[PDB]
Amino acid sequence: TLERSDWRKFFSEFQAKGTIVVADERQADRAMLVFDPVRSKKRYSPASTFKIPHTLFALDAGAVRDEFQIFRWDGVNRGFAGHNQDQDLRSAMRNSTVWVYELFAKEIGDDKARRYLKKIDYGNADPSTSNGDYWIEGSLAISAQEQIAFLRKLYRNELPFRVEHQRLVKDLMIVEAGRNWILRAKTGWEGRMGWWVGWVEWPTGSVFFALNIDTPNRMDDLFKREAIVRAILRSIEALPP
Numbered sequence: 323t324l325e326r327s328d329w330r331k332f333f334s335e336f337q338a339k340g341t342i343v344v345a346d347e348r349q350a351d352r353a354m355l356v357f358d359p360v361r362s363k364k365r366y367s368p369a370s371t372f373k374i375p376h377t378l379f380a381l382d383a384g385a386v387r388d389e390f391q392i393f394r395w396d397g398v399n400r401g402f403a404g405h406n407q408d409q410d411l412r413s414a415m416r417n418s419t420v421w422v423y424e425l426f427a428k429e430i431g432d433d434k435a436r437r438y439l440k441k442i443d444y445g446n447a448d449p450s451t452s453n454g455d456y457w458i459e460g461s462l463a464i465s466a467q468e469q470i471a472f473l474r475k476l477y478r479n480e481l482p483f484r485v486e487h488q489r490l491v492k493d494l495m496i497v498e499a500g501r502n503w504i505l506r507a508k509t510g511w512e513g514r515m516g517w518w519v520g521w522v523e524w525p526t527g528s529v530f531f532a533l534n535i536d537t538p539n540r541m542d543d544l545f546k547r548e549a550i551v552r553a554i555l556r557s558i559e560a561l562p563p
């Protein structure tokens with residue numbers, strides 16, 4: 323992995339402290355690019371980025387049939403606007419609707435989660451929790467480098483789930499596309515730090531990214547997750563201007 327310490331200008335452009343790993347598969351044998359290589363190997367809670375593997379778990383276990391199943395909302399104003407309504411997989415992914423995945427969690431075995439996480443070697447694969455949900459308030463942790471490794475498995479259909487379920491999750495991740503490019507990504511926010519992970523597919527190959535930053539300013543820092551990544555991806559012609 324090649325260290326791009328010059329990428330500090332992008333984090334400073336938005337007054338943030340964080341890391342990013344970028345794996346550029348356009349052409350061949352390009353070095354993996356990293357800002358802050360030590361932090362890039364530090365494990366953090368995946369927070370809402372866990373909805374990527376969590377959806378694979380729920381599909382593989384039968385907690386959700388497909389993209390057309392509607393999950394009826396219990397009528398309790400429990401999050402924000404997009405959470406307080408009936409959900410399908412796409413709305414839950416786009417709005418980061420926590421209560422759908424809480425429902426998936428209880429239906430999935432607590433032992434199944436362990437067997438799942440270990441079968442894919444996701445971070446430390448430890449869903450031990452004391453109170454909250456194990457993917458945000460628990461032992462489960464994964465580094466940026468480990469997110470890249472996981473996303474490439476999903477991209478290559480190499481994960482030990484039905485290829486149909488891998489394809490569905492990759493479709494649910496779509497946040498933007500042009501005629502020549504497709505961006506698939508998911509944000510996460512743990513409270514004190516935050517994520518944006520995913521990749522953008524071009525004709526000549528795909529560019530994977532995993533960024534985490536600290537979020538001392540809480541909500542006012544959330545835009546920085548995408549803003550830093552987009553500036554870096556644009557700098558390497560991985561997103562249009």
Ligand SMILES: *C(=O)N1C[C@H](NOS(=O)(=O)O)CC[C@H]1C(N)=O
Binds near residue numbers: 420
């Ligand atoms: C996921 O990290 N979360 C769910 C929700 N949306 O997060 S997102 O904007 O990063 O997709 C609120 C923040 C967070 C949580 N508190 O569970």
Ligand SMILES: [Ca+2]
Binds near residue numbers: 347348351
């Ligand atoms: Ca290539």
